[PDB]
Amino acid sequence: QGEFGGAPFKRFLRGTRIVSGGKLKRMTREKAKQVTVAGVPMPRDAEPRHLLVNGATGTGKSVLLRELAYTGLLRGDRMVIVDPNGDMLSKFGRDKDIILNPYDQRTKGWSFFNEIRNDYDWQRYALSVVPRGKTDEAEEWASYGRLLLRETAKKLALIGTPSMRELFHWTTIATFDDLRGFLEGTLAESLFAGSNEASKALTSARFVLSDKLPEHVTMPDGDFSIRSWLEDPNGGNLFITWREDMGPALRPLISAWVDVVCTSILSLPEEPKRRLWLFIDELASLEKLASLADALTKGRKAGLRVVAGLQSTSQLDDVYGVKEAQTLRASFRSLVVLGGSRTDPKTNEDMSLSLGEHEVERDALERVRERVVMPAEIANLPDLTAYVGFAGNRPIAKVPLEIKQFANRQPAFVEGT
Amino acid sequence: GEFGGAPFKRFLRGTRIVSGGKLKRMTREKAKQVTVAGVPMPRDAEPRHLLVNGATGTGKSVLLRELAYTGLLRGDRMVIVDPNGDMLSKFGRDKDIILNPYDQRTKGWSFFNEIRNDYDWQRYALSVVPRGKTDEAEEWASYGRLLLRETAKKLALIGTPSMRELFHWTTIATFDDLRGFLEGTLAESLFAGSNEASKALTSARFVLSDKLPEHVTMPDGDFSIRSWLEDPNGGNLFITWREDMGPALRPLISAWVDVVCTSILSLPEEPKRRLWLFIDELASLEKLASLADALTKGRKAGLRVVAGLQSTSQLDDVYGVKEAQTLRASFRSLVVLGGSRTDPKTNEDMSLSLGEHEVERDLERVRERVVMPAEIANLPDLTAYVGFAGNRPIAKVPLEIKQFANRQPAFVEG
Amino acid sequence: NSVGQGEFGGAPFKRFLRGTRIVSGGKLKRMTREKAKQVTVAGVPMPRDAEPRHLLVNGATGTGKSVLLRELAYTGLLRGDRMVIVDPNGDMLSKFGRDKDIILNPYDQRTKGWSFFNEIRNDYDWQRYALSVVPRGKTDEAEEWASYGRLLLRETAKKLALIGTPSMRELFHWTTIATFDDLRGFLEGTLAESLFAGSNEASKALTSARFVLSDKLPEHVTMPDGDFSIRSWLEDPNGGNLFITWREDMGPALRPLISAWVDVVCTSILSLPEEPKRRLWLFIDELASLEKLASLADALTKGRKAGLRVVAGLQSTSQLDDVYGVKEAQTLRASFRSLVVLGGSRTDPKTNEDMSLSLGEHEVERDRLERVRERVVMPAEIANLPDLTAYVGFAGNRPIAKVPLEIKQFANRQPAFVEG
Amino acid sequence: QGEFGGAPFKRFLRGTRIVSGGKLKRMTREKAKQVTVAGVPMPRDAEPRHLLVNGATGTGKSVLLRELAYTGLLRGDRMVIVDPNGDMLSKFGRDKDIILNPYDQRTKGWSFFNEIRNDYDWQRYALSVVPRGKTDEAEEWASYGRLLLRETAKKLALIGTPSMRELFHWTTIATFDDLRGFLEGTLAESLFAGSNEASKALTSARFVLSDKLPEHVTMPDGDFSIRSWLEDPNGGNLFITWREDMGPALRPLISAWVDVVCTSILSLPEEPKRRLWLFIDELASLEKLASLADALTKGRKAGLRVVAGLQSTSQLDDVYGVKEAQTLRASFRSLVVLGGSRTDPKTNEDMSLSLGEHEVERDRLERVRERVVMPAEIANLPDLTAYVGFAGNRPIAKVPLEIKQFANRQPAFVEG
Numbered sequence A: 001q002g003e004f005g006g007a008p009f010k011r012f013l014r015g016t017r018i019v020s021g022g023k024l025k026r027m028t029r030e031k032a033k034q035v036t037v038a039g040v041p042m043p044r045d046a047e048p049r050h051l052l053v054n055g056a057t058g059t060g061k062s063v064l065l066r067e068l069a070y071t072g073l074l075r076g077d078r079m080v081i082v083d084p085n086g087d088m089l090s091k092f093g094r095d096k097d098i099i100l101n102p103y104d105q106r107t108k109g110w111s112f113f114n115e116i117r118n119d120y121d122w123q124r125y126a127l128s129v130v131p132r133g134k135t136d137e138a139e140e141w142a143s144y145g146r147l148l149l150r151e152t153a154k155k156l157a158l159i160g161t162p163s164m165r166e167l168f169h170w171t172t173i174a175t176f177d178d179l180r181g182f183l184e185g186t187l188a189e190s191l192f193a194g195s196n197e198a199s200k201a202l203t204s205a206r207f208v209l210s211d212k213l214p215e216h217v218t219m220p221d222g223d224f225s226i227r228s229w230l231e232d233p234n235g236g237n238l239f240i241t242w243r244e245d246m247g248p249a250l251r252p253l254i255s256a257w258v259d260v261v262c263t264s265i266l267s268l269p270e271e272p273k274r275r276l277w278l279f280i281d282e283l284a285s286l287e288k289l290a291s292l293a294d295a296l297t298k299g300r301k302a303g304l305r306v307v308a309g310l311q312s313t314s315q316l317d318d319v320y321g322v323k324e325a326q327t328l329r330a331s332f333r334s335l336v337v338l339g340g341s342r343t344d345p346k347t348n349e350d351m352s353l354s355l356g357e358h359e360v361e362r363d364a365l366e367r368v369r370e371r372v373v374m375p376a377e378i379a380n381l382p383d384l385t386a387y388v389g390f391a392g393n394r395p396i397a398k399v400p401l402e403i404k405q406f407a408n409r410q411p412a413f414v415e416g417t
Numbered sequence B: 001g002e003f004g005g006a007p008f009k010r011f012l013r014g015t016r017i018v019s020g021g022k023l024k025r026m027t028r029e030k031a032k033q034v035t036v037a038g039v040p041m042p043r044d045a046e047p048r049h050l051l052v053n054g055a056t057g058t059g060k061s062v063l064l065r066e067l068a069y070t071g072l073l074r075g076d077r078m079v080i081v082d083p084n085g086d087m088l089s090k091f092g093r094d095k096d097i098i099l100n101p102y103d104q105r106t107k108g109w110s111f112f113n114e115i116r117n118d119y120d121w122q123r124y125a126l127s128v129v130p131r132g133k134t135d136e137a138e139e140w141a142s143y144g145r146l147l148l149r150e151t152a153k154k155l156a157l158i159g160t161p162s163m164r165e166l167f168h169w170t171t172i173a174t175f176d177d178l179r180g181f182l183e184g185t186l187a188e189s190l191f192a193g194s195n196e197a198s199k200a201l202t203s204a205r206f207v208l209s210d211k212l213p214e215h216v217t218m219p220d221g222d223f224s225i226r227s228w229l230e231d232p233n234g235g236n237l238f239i240t241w242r243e244d245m246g247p248a249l250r251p252l253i254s255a256w257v258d259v260v261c262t263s264i265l266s267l268p269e270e271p272k273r274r275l276w277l278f279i280d281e282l283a284s285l286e287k288l289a290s291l292a293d294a295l296t297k298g299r300k301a302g303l304r305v306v307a308g309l310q311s312t313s314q315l316d317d318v319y320g321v322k323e324a325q326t327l328r329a330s331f332r333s334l335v336v337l338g339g340s341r342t343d344p345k346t347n348e349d350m351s352l353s354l355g356e357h358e359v360e361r362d363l364e365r366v367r368e369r370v371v372m373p374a375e376i377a378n379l380p381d382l383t384a385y386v387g388f389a390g391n392r393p394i395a396k397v398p399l400e401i402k403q404f405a406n407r408q409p410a411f412v413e414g
Numbered sequence C: 001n002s003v004g005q006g007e008f009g010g011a012p013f014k015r016f017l018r019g020t021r022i023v024s025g026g027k028l029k030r031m032t033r034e035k036a037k038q039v040t041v042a043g044v045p046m047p048r049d050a051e052p053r054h055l056l057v058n059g060a061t062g063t064g065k066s067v068l069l070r071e072l073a074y075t076g077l078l079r080g081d082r083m084v085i086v087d088p089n090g091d092m093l094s095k096f097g098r099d100k101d102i103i104l105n106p107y108d109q110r111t112k113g114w115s116f117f118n119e120i121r122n123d124y125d126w127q128r129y130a131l132s133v134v135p136r137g138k139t140d141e142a143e144e145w146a147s148y149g150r151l152l153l154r155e156t157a158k159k160l161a162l163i164g165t166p167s168m169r170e171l172f173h174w175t176t177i178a179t180f181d182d183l184r185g186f187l188e189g190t191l192a193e194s195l196f197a198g199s200n201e202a203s204k205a206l207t208s209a210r211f212v213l214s215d216k217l218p219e220h221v222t223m224p225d226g227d228f229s230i231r232s233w234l235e236d237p238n239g240g241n242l243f244i245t246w247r248e249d250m251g252p253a254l255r256p257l258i259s260a261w262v263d264v265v266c267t268s269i270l271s272l273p274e275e276p277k278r279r280l281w282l283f284i285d286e287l288a289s290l291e292k293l294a295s296l297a298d299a300l301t302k303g304r305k306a307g308l309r310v311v312a313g314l315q316s317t318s319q320l321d322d323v324y325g326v327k328e329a330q331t332l333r334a335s336f337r338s339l340v341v342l343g344g345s346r347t348d349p350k351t352n353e354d355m356s357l358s359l360g361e362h363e364v365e366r367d368r369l370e371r372v373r374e375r376v377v378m379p380a381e382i383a384n385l386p387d388l389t390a391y392v393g394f395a396g397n398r399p400i401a402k403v404p405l406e407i408k409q410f411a412n413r414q415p416a417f418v419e420g
Numbered sequence D: 001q002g003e004f005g006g007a008p009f010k011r012f013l014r015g016t017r018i019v020s021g022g023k024l025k026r027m028t029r030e031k032a033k034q035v036t037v038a039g040v041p042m043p044r045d046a047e048p049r050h051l052l053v054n055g056a057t058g059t060g061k062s063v064l065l066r067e068l069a070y071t072g073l074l075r076g077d078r079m080v081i082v083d084p085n086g087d088m089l090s091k092f093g094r095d096k097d098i099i100l101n102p103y104d105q106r107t108k109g110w111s112f113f114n115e116i117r118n119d120y121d122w123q124r125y126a127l128s129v130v131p132r133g134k135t136d137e138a139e140e141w142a143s144y145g146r147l148l149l150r151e152t153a154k155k156l157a158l159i160g161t162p163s164m165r166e167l168f169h170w171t172t173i174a175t176f177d178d179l180r181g182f183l184e185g186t187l188a189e190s191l192f193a194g195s196n197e198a199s200k201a202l203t204s205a206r207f208v209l210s211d212k213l214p215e216h217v218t219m220p221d222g223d224f225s226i227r228s229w230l231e232d233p234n235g236g237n238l239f240i241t242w243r244e245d246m247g248p249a250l251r252p253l254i255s256a257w258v259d260v261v262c263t264s265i266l267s268l269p270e271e272p273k274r275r276l277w278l279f280i281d282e283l284a285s286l287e288k289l290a291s292l293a294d295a296l297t298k299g300r301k302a303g304l305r306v307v308a309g310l311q312s313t314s315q316l317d318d319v320y321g322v323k324e325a326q327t328l329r330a331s332f333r334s335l336v337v338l339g340g341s342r343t344d345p346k347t348n349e350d351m352s353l354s355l356g357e358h359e360v361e362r363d364r365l366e367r368v369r370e371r372v373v374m375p376a377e378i379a380n381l382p383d384l385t386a387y388v389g390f391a392g393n394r395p396i397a398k399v400p401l402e403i404k405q406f407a408n409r410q411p412a413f414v415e416g
């Protein structure tokens, strides 16, 4: 019926309802200041319910996340942006804003040590340094990796040498015996000794840490604490940047930071006025994050608002596993479909099914149940065109994305010389 | 008017939907009852359990709070897995118990306090060391329980039922010392004689090093959940914790919930007993070893379990698909609060659960879902479909946010 | 029932509602025709914006993938585009190879001298290219070994470089010939010094790494030496085109080497300097024939800026599935916005179904009114397509069309192979 | 309709078209000499796109392959025939023809050593001797088996003793240490030493070679080369025969020969006039061939034409794996369905689906999409009746197979 691609109908019975772009825009418009999603103002209550932007590469995920960041800043919200090539940084970065990039002159000095405040914070952040294993077996090695990491990094802290270079030496360079000796006195003293199984466990933990820690070590150090930054209202915005050719090298470090924010907001003091955004341009690009799940379910009070991008259902599935991936996607109440490749009929089907069906009375009438949006309609979407379906009881609408231009108020990258 | 689909001439068979009010009159009984989203719960549906499935922020709290409240007004006892002490601060009385290693008001506890017979050693070893996520992980877990039960059994024998002693032995003492200490116990030989035997020991250590931590640092006392259950005048138990420590306390919290699950099976036959078990988020605990039997053999002890879920993939990931199905299946009453449109599989599951009906229209026999997956995806907050156990129709009802005054501080730093 | 004749193979319809729309060949050709110079796909001018969105050409053997890729290469050359061609039996080389063009074939007299050492420029480039030399393992277990093999490879080759002997022969000797102890000793001082020692597990891991490197390195070693760098070649505008050739009977022997070169390009374009004028094509005649490339996915997602345009061929969905795994293969195919279906065997109903579904359905209104949802192209229509006939469905909002492939003839301006 | 078993229709819209036996025979008939498939002349361009004949046992797979072979010989094509019990050899074998059977008086002397011409040929044919493992794990062992085989066999050749008996001794009889010693100087010197894993690997390689090599050793010695035979125009035809009760024992050797042909044709010199047939009576009966895939895809210019038989989709699936078996079946552009058991509904469905559906317009007007051939129609096919669907755009046809009689121009077997 105009805003509905299929045959017009006489009466809408139940299910997903689709409305015109403008019609939606008036429906979601509210008294208070709001952020916009592809020109449509986002319902204030849908913000802490999170947003998922699914779409093939080049369809407008950037234009959209850029606009969402912009309107959020104009309202004065704070935010963390996993920002590739410092694009968002060059457009919205102010002078009081933070930068995390081991190769950027302007980056702050950091070590996970800087986040430890209580004893339970050791495993908490070991979980962030060493993300979840892709497979059950890889997770088993990871757990030994965390054991070795936490007990070793704990002792180094005790003995006044919370050195990352030291922790790395111990965990991956020192001989098996030396390490064993250093571990004496720690909960790990006996756990990694006594059988071939125990030695194997230690070897596995070594390999893990040798894989995860490199970047953390070469990370410029300082006293910066993501925890303290979150608690500081006058703290700026955090931009996690990196050059694309190094994406794979920094995957474990960047996932570390993203996870740190995820656990940390759970510890921030009860503050109703806080509004923190978490921008993860490509969710399936980070490692299987340990705390993301809880952050997406218990971050309302902290005022957490997560926006994530995805392309094919198989990407997240491969990283988190099918079961765990479904749960992850399910935690984003608000969805945006940007149209994908016709070569990916499975995700187009998944997106079509998510947008949902409606039961209509068409034209002796007739009741018909049909997809509001056909997989084919998603496959044939032109660029900068999106279907916006906000959390809760709202109708969805096909809306165009407009490319607004933003001036570069800072260099995206600054060589670490 | 209440069936979202096209009106029909005649209902033939299947799931029947009725108006909120119509149902409230149908389910209302003479005796005192508790309410579910404003609907009086059939007295016989209480021990058949209730499952509340819904996306985050849909009203799972408002509903569980309501149930708890109406259950208290009726004088029913209850154990509440209460995050951030929300429930505690609203309904906690002075005679009520608090379990939180980090709250000044907590009772002192150790699983030792629940041992009364010999068979209680494995029974609660299963509570301390929950079921493994995988078949391999469970193999380790069982080694961990052997190590646990035999070491903790000797420590009790020699008059030193110390959790710090148990922890030292099982994860700190060297292999040989431990081996020595185990001599004379059923585990004397089992963990010796081959590389395999030493491997099983190594696996049991790791498990116990993962599970025991919080049990050790837990404040000491002679509090017994078993005894608490047998005491009529005992208050209500509030298991609380600060969210940023949820992961850390996951094994401990699961321990307590499980303990309740096995223990109620040993309570003396008491027809007058009405005990509620509130697990805000079922998939958030570990794979509980005794929950299954509790949901099947707790009628006689008066057990009433209420649990919340979000995505079917959550429970599935923790219990495994086969086991998770059996678990969800044990809850006779269901409440659907509406989920994300990004989770079509669960919405489909809930739609299917609500069921289909065969209807006759303007004739035409039609089979259709009473509630479409889409209708559940588009439900507004504080709106739920209530489908009680047995032969009852379902109804879409609105949840009302009743306000409760804080009659106690949610947390009290120790 | 007007619409649906000479375009849609099904019953003609009264009104098109939604979904995939099919148009005639000619009608598509004017629709996609643009002002700027364009390349052609089966005679159909390709949308300039569809180029960096990549193209996937699926079809049974002998249906015309060659005629198509050859045509694409040709028109791309006429426009002055640069390109890297995975060229079996030097066919493309013999038709389009010029004198300034590069050749990579360890057994061709004209090949350039290469070693992955030639691509190392920063420290992060060691693991980066260890990923290229040692592709992803087919199974989770095989990948575990692969990682050990990359650890051994990167630390050993790193030291050899430090000590001024960046030798492939030396690297090969150390990693697969020297005894466990000697290697262990050479490794002292490097990150792997302790990692490969201390338990049976550690020694097992070293043994696994040795096996992998003994499997991948062979051809790298026998590869004629030189200072040629694929990275530097990419940065050089006047650099010609790169033809990676090989004789078919050696395909399996060079599979690991060739996969390394293709991956080298896939990571390297990510480091090229921002140049809006760059147009680089990557022709991989048969994607499932190379190994599970480590950098492909990111290149198909982050190469627009570098001007990367990938063109790949496939036959049965099970081929790429077996190499990359089902999930990872889905993601990969999904990264190609444009599709060309050439028709498969009737003995492969699963793939014909996959292609039919990818081509999509349409919802139409026909007479007797009835709304009908149906596949624009049936699996049977694809199974029954004659040779040199294809369905072209460009990226974005464009209709698809059935077009005939014309066999243009190209004179041999160079011998396909030279030497032994 | 007299061709289509379902309800006649007013108009054909799209999909698979079915035509009468005769109608198809006129359609496919060509000017050039052709071979026939169940009486139907096979399109010349469909020959190098291969032919797959699916059918239950006793439906006529033999009558058909026999017919194909005969008409192929009448045209003068050369061929390799995996020939059970020497049936094909006894009807078409001439005197210049080759026979490979370790237990037949008339066999040629062979060793894989006879196929080595360049260095890359060692692994190439170690792949032929040691076929692909049924499981990922079994293949891991097989890869160690090939490492052990190629390095050992290579040295033995280097030192002037290319003995199959020497190779077998070294790889499965010599003690671990001696072997290790012998391997010194070869690429495998260190690879199989240094840890328990290294020793485990060696042990795996021994087991594998001990399973595969047996028949290779006991195989009569000679200087015959399948490679050279292929390059020789005047070379006859190759009949790979064996008595059925020994099928399991010879499975690894016969699979080796088939694979050698599969890789070797990739090295033959460019010859547009060559027409070489590869008859594999039952594809799932050989091992997971390492080079079949590439042969079914890159053998056009060598003139390879492959004809294979199958019964149930589960057979090939179990040997090659579901993914790899689909890829394999998909590489045969032409298909023949002979009718299967009603106890194998899945394969009948796979064949029905492969045959395809059509969208038709019938008078009640109704557009209907339906299987041209129902699973049930294939389950109920009488013997010697088949559906012939050539590669490309041709209709399919239900045709009868005629049992032509061929005189025995040679004994099937000759005890040695």
Ligand SMILES: Nc1nc2c(ncn2[C@@H]2O[C@H](COP(=O)(O)OP(=O)(O)NP(=O)(O)O)[C@@H](O)[C@H]2O)c(=O)[nH]1
Binding pocket: A056, A057, A058, A059, A060, A061, A062, A063, A064, A383, A384, A403, C301, C304, C305
């Ligand atoms: N002509 C033009 N189009 C632009 C420009 N910037 C953005 N666009 C439009 O926006 C689209 C890309 O959207 P975007 O959200 O950046 O895509 P992405 O997948 O996030 N990133 P990328 O484009 O790098 O792959 C293009 O298809 C184009 O239509 C520009 O400078 N010129």
Ligand SMILES: Nc1nc2c(ncn2[C@@H]2O[C@H](COP(=O)(O)OP(=O)(O)NP(=O)(O)O)[C@@H](O)[C@H]2O)c(=O)[nH]1
Binding pocket: A364, A365
């Ligand atoms: N089925 C149907 N027929 C109707 C309706 N209203 C009027 N009719 C009358 O019935 C005729 C069609 O009946 P119908 O049962 O659909 O015919 P059919 O196509 O043979 N049956 P089917 O669709 O089950 O295959 C129309 O020509 C019309 O005159 C209605 O709502 N449903």
Ligand SMILES: Nc1nc2c(ncn2[C@@H]2O[C@H](COP(=O)(O)OP(=O)(O)NP(=O)(O)O)[C@@H](O)[C@H]2O)c(=O)[nH]1
Binding pocket: A297, A300, A301, B055, B056, B057, B058, B059, B060, B061, B062, B063, B381, B382, B401
């Ligand atoms: N105005 C108001 N609404 C409330 C209050 N508590 C809950 N609600 C309503 O109920 C919804 C959340 O329900 P609730 O049961 O707390 O959700 P939950 O998932 O169990 N926990 P949470 O709300 O912390 O995310 C909110 O979206 C809001 O509409 C309150 O104190 N005031």
Ligand SMILES: Nc1nc2c(ncn2[C@@H]2O[C@H](COP(=O)(O)OP(=O)(O)NP(=O)(O)O)[C@@H](O)[C@H]2O)c(=O)[nH]1
Binding pocket: C060, C061, C062, C063, C064, C065, C066, C067, C068, C387, C388, C407, D300
């Ligand atoms: N006359 C002729 N036809 C050709 C030529 N190249 C390809 N063809 C035609 O196109 C078909 C094969 O197409 P092609 O794209 O080469 O197929 P491919 O699968 O990529 N490779 P191949 O042809 O080697 O099997 C042949 O059957 C033939 O009809 C040529 O040089 N001359």
Ligand SMILES: Nc1nc2c(ncn2[C@@H]2O[C@H](COP(=O)(O)OP(=O)(O)NP(=O)(O)O)[C@@H](O)[C@H]2O)c(=O)[nH]1
Binding pocket: D056, D057, D058, D059, D060, D061, D062, D063, D064, D383, D384, D403
């Ligand atoms: N009268 C007759 N019928 C034959 C002869 N050879 C085959 N047939 C017919 O064809 C059927 C077997 O066909 P065939 O192609 O040999 O089957 P196969 O499965 O390849 N081998 P087999 O028959 O050994 O099981 C027999 O059941 C019979 O009806 C023959 O010499 N005489």
